[PDB]
């Protein structure tokens, strides 16, 4: 159909259709009379998987031969989302798949509905790791993904009355297809017990042993033939377990507990014992299935050459039980000298933060640690000693250093710092964009950064164009590749070749003719699936993102409130007309989160029933936001929000999506924001609000939020409203929280920005009136995307912190 | 190689070579250096379980067009054992996969051999139900077996220090491939709640839901082309299930336990309430999925052609929940009024007994059933008191009576009495042998015999000759083939032809023959499984089945303590050689079955390493006996032990299984014994000890068993040496409570049979001196071995309770 797609060559389609029927028959154990489309997923599902395996077994023979470095890149979260389509396109079968499904009489986009997500992540922590495997396997490195196989990933988010429910995401009931499971490889980890010391060593002893199976999900790179592996363990008991006997039976559920269940917070540290359990579990099984690989390797006992052929990347400090599991493995099982392993385990790992927010940083409180971990405990103690030797030594006398830079801290209750412990036992400590990169060495980790200022370094976050781009937006893909070709889907940087098409007339009625049919698609999608009425002629105005104060979603709020005013203070104005969709999920303790989605449809319920408006404001509470329905939403956006206040967003990825896709952004001078604005030019960019400088200036001589309430009649009138009942005019004092919050204790100054905001707004709205330039600034932000790229930021860890080669090249089919 | 085992024809052959290959390659994604002989196991699984496919659809299809009366069989537990084998053979694919295998460098037998039993039962009653389903494939009949899929068999025995452990049956790790997973037809079932009385009458509500999802197993008949289906239910919590989060997820596991794990009680009730649970588990299920199809069928709201299309038969009193189900759901739901429900289910249901046993009878505390039931209850009461208005009018003025028919038990708790209810709301109850029947009749229910006697029937269980023939014993199988054919097979009455070859010589030697190869071939499996080292010239004397009082374990133990102490007597005299094995799991809580077993073993403690016995006598104790364990011991056994008190076991199965394979039995007259040396002649039978009159005689009198202890030297002699710890020397009074137990409270009577068991022992050993007599007898008991086939037993159940004609007929192919 569309060229990007494939080859539909005739002699692949008929392989494909008998295929087909041989499964449907077969594996599934079903016949035309009776198959449901879900049937219909399954058969195509299972005939596309037949694809993979050959190049996935040939993959890890080539690296058997080969015997190269390999990457180990340990997460808890895998937010994989779909893997239908996504395996077609990578593998060239698009086009063939469409017409097979054709010639039987089934529309194949009816069956990729049907698949769930594989929810297994919270939002760009989890993504983040998605798009990274995606990009290791096009760039052929040896690489593999370790995780928990959760049984429930990230809930199911349903409104009831405006109010946010949780419902469990059972996304395995009907089977995952795509996995194997691997119950030959199970391995033992094991808990609790108490240290014995012998003249032999340490031993470890009177454990609880939980069992580790492994599932494989295949991984393939972007039509070069590579199938790398993501591995995933799951809990299961010893069959000795306990072993009145029913109950003893039974109980084998608390050990089976482990892989259960996703823990819902983004960027949030909760310090309860299953989840320090899952951390130690994936980080206990994964090492094991590393050092059992090492050894059974084409090489040479020998833990010196482990460096030059292991490399683990810490995804935040989740995994950071990988530093003192490996000394432990290395001293206490192997033998080797304290110092030895210390210098394998430091040119072996590697950690990426995440975020610089507090109450996200791990500490886990010793007594815990104490319990189910003595002996990994013991080992930090030592570490830590050794650790504040080298920064006595460095600085004498200054005693300050010391225990701010102790890995234990002190206090009512002591705890330990994972953030310090991987910095401390880590080659290479990378921020996740330019400037949270320089914040963690001017700020945060000012003090390890001046003791070792070579290990810092910075790998700006990127996304896959494969899902990204080639996936969710074909039109928007065939258009660029009818102008410069295909090349750029795995060269991104290409792109800038689209900038002598800024006037280009053709071109420009193109990109503005597949942003209208996104948009014409996507307004389908809301009314056959939640009876929602939008016009499509409107500005699409998005805020995706899990709901966080930080994010400002409150901010957004007040601008939709404020352009409501506006239309009722003088009614027969012309305003240019927008749909704002606001998006995502809050985590089920954080009462906050959930008052803010509570406002959100409580405006929807005001704005999108008063006549006076029209269809000119309209508010839409997007449900259950994920990555399928990024995979729509994004697509159909004219506007995107990046609006969290400077110095909070690390890097943000969204953002990024947006911009491959044609929607322009409104934001502050925020994570890879900045880095956007660079490639593509201040001008392009509706930049707004404090600086980093801005919001410290105001820090010291202290954030009175009275002020602006004060000064901003505008904004008076908004907090007046919310307070008197407005909004909610059977409950008056319903959003009392907010306005307190927001007068009182606001950590994050969203009246500072409102000024600034509106205006900019306003700019955006000028901007919309004339179609012609909009989408010659859209030109502009999609041809200098290139950066942003998850393949320039694998290269970049590749070369920089790995030291492995990216490769383009083929393998044998 | 064999004649009984198939075409081996060069184009099968390398078909199924290759669909091997593409097994191990795209379903196992392995390759020649890697797959392990488990993964051989499952390539060969799954390219056998291919050829089923094709016919399950096509069976069902059939049963569709023709609409035909079906059978239910309800039963809690289905023990199938292993799978492969009884496939192939069923297929005629057995010798065209040895080809095929051979071809590939690989033995099928050592395969074979890495496959799990389906556990999912205790002894008799579970087994039944496998052949059961087996015979009504091979005949034919539209049938369904309905079950529970268990996550954990009947446990492991681990013998240790001579005492059981038991662990868990882990049968799933690797995975079944065997079953489909149904998820598309998860059904509701219903707990606790209340009771609303409207006009519109009953309603249950505030009911906890559990879902009930089915897995689906194909049950092929032999060489029939007829693949039935066995639908097995797993528990799974509901979505919106409690929904502080994570608790939410992990207590799901709470509705799950009810698919958990099988109750390990052989013939003992436990009224626990997780059992209860799984009971109305099963029955709530398969209810809705009966009526269901029975509103889906081509045919015309209208109950009343019900009973001509459905017949569901109970396995025992624990689906007896069925009963007011069916009510529940005609009154409730269908709004039939009571009397011609009542009508509609009487016609539908039938009740097999299998035991008469006070402490196995299901008698349900009504308080468990009012918390957890309550409409159900309800419904048993009206039940009950329309019965009774039965009975008042039948009997007036007999009010004993109506106490004992009552439903309800009266005393410090009440209960309700479920073998009661299945008689009052069954068109037909029986017994599972002559006997059995009769002992119904004329104790245990002769007031419901008075009431209604046309209800009352016999149905003398069976085995299948494909399992317990064909399969485990091919050497013997052919022998008779050669002479006879095959179709005794599908027809075992053929077997008579056998007697015209009494005094065949030819014949003689090959008899002799197979069983010397079976009992080298198991001596074997002992050495390299268990390095225990057995004489095979020996006489192999085995009792196997469930380790219980009833079956008299204890009597052979006594036997074998006086074989020993005969030898030790006079050294030097000869005595014919035996190995006694004795094997069989105990309930977990059953501790005198556990002390049982420990004396067994403390028996061959010291017999096995007497150097005066020598290789005259061993005493053997067979650790985890099951089905796959039976299939190996019963072809290489002599005599079979079938030595339970007169009256207390209802048939026996075991019994027929060393009857068909060339053992010898030495029983009392009970249970099928009866009947198997009536079609033998009783010169062909060891019968001794007393009959079902003599224990009456004894029980009036009242039993002493002082009176034997005083008059039997030998028996004096050995409870002396039990009581001295002669077996137990560092435990001297270890076996006090058995010893304990045999004098003052043992209700077996044990010692009544002691003096004509030791006598009737000495005349096996008599014609054991005479080989060619031994066979002679041998071939007189194989050769009448036919009306003991499941195929005689499931035309008789067609026949005379569910009335539908047994078909022999082939389907296409
Ligand atoms: C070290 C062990 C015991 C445990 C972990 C393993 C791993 O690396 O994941 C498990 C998987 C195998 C068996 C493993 C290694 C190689 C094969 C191989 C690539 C071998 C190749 O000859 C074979 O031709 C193929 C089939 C290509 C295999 C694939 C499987 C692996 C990678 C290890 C085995
Ligand atoms: C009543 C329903 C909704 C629930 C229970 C069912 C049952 O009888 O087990 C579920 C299974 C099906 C769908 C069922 C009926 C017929 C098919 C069929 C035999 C139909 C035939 O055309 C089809 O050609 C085949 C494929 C032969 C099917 C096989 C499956 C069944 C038996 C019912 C469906």
Known sequence: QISVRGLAGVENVTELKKNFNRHLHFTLVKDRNV????????????????????????TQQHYYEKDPKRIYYLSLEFYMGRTLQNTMVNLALENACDEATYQLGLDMEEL????????????????????????????????????????????????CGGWQMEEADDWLRYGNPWEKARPEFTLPVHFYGRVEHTSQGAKWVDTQVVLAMPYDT??????????????????????????????????????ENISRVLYPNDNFFEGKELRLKQEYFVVAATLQDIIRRFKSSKFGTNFDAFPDKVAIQLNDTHPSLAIPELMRVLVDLERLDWDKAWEVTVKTCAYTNHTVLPEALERWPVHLLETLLPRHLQIIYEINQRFLNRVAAAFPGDVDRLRRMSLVEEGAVKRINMAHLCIAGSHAVNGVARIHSEILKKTIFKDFYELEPHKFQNKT????????????????????????????????????????????????????????????????????????????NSLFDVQVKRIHEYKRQLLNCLHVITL???????????????????????????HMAKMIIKLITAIGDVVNHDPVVGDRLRVIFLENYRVSLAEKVIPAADLSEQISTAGTEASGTGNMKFMLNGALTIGTMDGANVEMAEEAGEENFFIFGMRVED???????????????????????????????????????????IVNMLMHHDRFKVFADYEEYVKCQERVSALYKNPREWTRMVIRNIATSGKFSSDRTIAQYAREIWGVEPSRQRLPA
């Open 35 to 58: 198959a449901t489309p879900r049937d219909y997923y399954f058969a195509l599902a299972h005939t596309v998987r037949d694809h993979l395996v050959g190049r996935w077994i040939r």
């Open 112 to 159: 990729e509905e049907i698949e769930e997500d594989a929810g297994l992540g919270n939002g760009g922590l989890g993504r983040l790791a998605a798009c990274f495997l995606d990009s290791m396997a096009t760039l052929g490195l040896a690489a593999y993904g370790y995780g928990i196989r959760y049984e429930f990933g990230i809930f199911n988010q349903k409104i």
């Open 218 to 255: 295949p991984v393939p790179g972007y039509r070069n033939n590579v199938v790398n592996t993501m591995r995933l363990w799951s809990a299961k008991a010893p069959n000795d377990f306990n072993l009145g006997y029913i109950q003893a039976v039974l109980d084998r559920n608390l050990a």
């Open 461 to 536: 976050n990127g996304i896959t164009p494969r899902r990204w781009l080639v996936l969710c937006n074909p039109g928007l893909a065939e258009i660029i590749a009818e102008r410069i070709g295909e090349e750029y889907i795995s060269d991104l940087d290409q792109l800038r070749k689209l900038l002598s098409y800024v006037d280009d007339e053709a071109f420009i009625r193109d990109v503005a003719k597949v942003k209208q049919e996104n948009k014409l698609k996507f307004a389908a999608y809301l009314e056959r699936e939640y009876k929602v009425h939008i016009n499509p």
């Open 564 to 590: 409501y005013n506006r239309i009722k203070k003088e009614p027969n104005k012309f305003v240019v007309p927008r749909t704002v969709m606001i998006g995502g999920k809050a985590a089920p303790g954080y």
């Open 695 to 737: 919001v410290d200036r105001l820090d010291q001589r202290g954030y009175n939020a009275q002020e602006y309430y004060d000064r901003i009649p505008e904004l008076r009138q908004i907090i007046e409203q919310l307070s008197s009942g407005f909004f909610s005019p059977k409950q008056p004092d319903l959003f009392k929280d």
